[PDB]
Design a protein around this ligand. Sequence first.
Ligand SMILES: Nc1ncnc2c1ncn2[C@@H]1O[C@@H]2COP(=O)(O)O[C@H]2[C@H]1O
Ligand SMILES: Nc1ncnc2c1ncn2[C@@H]1O[C@@H]2COP(=O)(O)O[C@H]2[C@H]1O
Ligand SMILES: Nc1ncnc2c1ncn2[C@@H]1O[C@@H]2COP(=O)(O)O[C@H]2[C@H]1O
Ligand SMILES: Nc1ncnc2c1ncn2[C@@H]1O[C@@H]2COP(=O)(O)O[C@H]2[C@H]1O
Lengths: 200, 200
Amino acid sequence: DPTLEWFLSHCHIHKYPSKSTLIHQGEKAETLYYIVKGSVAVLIKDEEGKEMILSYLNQGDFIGELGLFEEGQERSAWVRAKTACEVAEISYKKFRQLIQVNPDILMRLSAQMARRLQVTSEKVGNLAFLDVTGRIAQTLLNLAKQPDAMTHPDGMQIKITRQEIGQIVGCSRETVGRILKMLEDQNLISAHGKTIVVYG
Amino acid sequence: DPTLEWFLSHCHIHKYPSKSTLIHQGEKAETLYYIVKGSVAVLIKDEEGKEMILSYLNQGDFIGELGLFEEGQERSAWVRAKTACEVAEISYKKFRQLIQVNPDILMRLSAQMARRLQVTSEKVGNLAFLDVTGRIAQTLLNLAKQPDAMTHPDGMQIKITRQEIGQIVGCSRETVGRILKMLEDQNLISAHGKTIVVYG
DNA sequence: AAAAATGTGAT
DNA sequence: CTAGATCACATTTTT
DNA sequence: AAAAATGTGAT
DNA sequence: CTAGATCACATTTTT
Ligand SMILES: Nc1ncnc2c1ncn2[C@@H]1O[C@@H]2COP(=O)(O)O[C@H]2[C@H]1O
Ligand SMILES: Nc1ncnc2c1ncn2[C@@H]1O[C@@H]2COP(=O)(O)O[C@H]2[C@H]1O
Ligand SMILES: Nc1ncnc2c1ncn2[C@@H]1O[C@@H]2COP(=O)(O)O[C@H]2[C@H]1O
Ligand SMILES: Nc1ncnc2c1ncn2[C@@H]1O[C@@H]2COP(=O)(O)O[C@H]2[C@H]1O
């Protein structure tokens, strides 16, 4: 679409390599990111330093927006690159202007925040409402049904560690494994190493 | 401020009585609400029908916005009146126009969604990261330090059932009580009926 | 009058 | 090791 | 070479 | 009654 590239045309593009960190939690916020390609993980931590993945984001997504509507906003979470990334960046100040000349961009952003509020709210329910098994199961279905999931005679195949699965559903790595083994004993999946086949 | 009343001047005001329901979950969304006075609770439910309070909202807050950026959006949660309310209402369609003539209103809304995303994300951490006691404690401190909390020689006094406390932190009513009694045994609070005094 | 909100105490 | 959920009336509290 | 990610099995 | 967390190496897997 036009408008997207007018905005882009006003951003510095940057690349980050997998595992690097685009946004530092609690730092002062003055920039807005747009992921042109690649994948990132928004994550929060606890005192011990244990992590909690609040969400993933991909091509198309805006990052670093929450601290865009009030002076002295600090970053709410850390943003790490899931994969190699190309991210458009633009100053808050600069961006603000674009809006004035074009209120569509601001609308498009807000839609994304709107969508996010739903997922996070949904995720709040999930924890309050489902057990780890239940949560883990759901996570395997979503992943398994994504663009990156792979094809497999018996269903769809995903690749991920029991560590990162635990930081998505909010449980310990040991608990993921005990449950992954139970899900296999129930013939729902087959898991070898980081590879897991969700049957279908 | 000016702009607020220009917007208001384009809304039908309505009153709802405590316990009534302003928004029906899953219904088609076409209206946007603005709370002119009173308090509401955004809540989600599970199959059993058990509730989970995602948040409270008060004078100043917008409601019914998530389903404002895409055709055929359905309400994400139920909205019930905590207290007697006066809520400005305006069609999505109508509202959209105001924005065009004035992009400040749309900005002001987005700020609120932004703020919300933070609290909900924070709330996600809270569950993933704290135990009920920990969660309950935090809830008593927030409530206790609000405009409605009451004054008391020993600290601040709040009034609320162990039922609604459980639907905020996400635990059972029985568990709230066991913990409220433990918090008293630790001399942190004093609880008689719905009344609780958080010491200070 | 009943509903509404709580409490056991065990398990 | 041990935090929560669940149970099903009799007992308080509200509307 | 080590880090990184896992697994026990008990409790 | 019973779902999770925690523990601290020896054992796989990566970078
Ligand atoms: N709950 C969430 N869901 C999705 N993205 C989020 C969430 N919380 C934070 N983010 C993103 O992570 C960023 C962290 O810093 P910012 O507050 O600048 O902006 C935040 C968003 O871009
Ligand atoms: N309540 C929680 N308890 C334990 N780990 C958690 C929790 N919430 C999120 N996590 C994270 O999820 C991760 C799962 O694998 P780890 O045990 O390596 O580390 C865990 C933490 O980083
Ligand atoms: N997590 C949340 N935090 C705050 N308010 C919310 C949240 N989820 C939903 N709401 C409000 O509740 C409304 C439910 O219907 P809508 O999707 O129209 O718009 C939603 C918001 O106004
Ligand atoms: N995981 C959960 N288990 C039980 N109740 C929950 C949960 N998450 C939210 N809730 C709600 O919190 C309420 C606490 O009091 P109740 O037992 O009356 O009913 C409970 C549910 O409506």
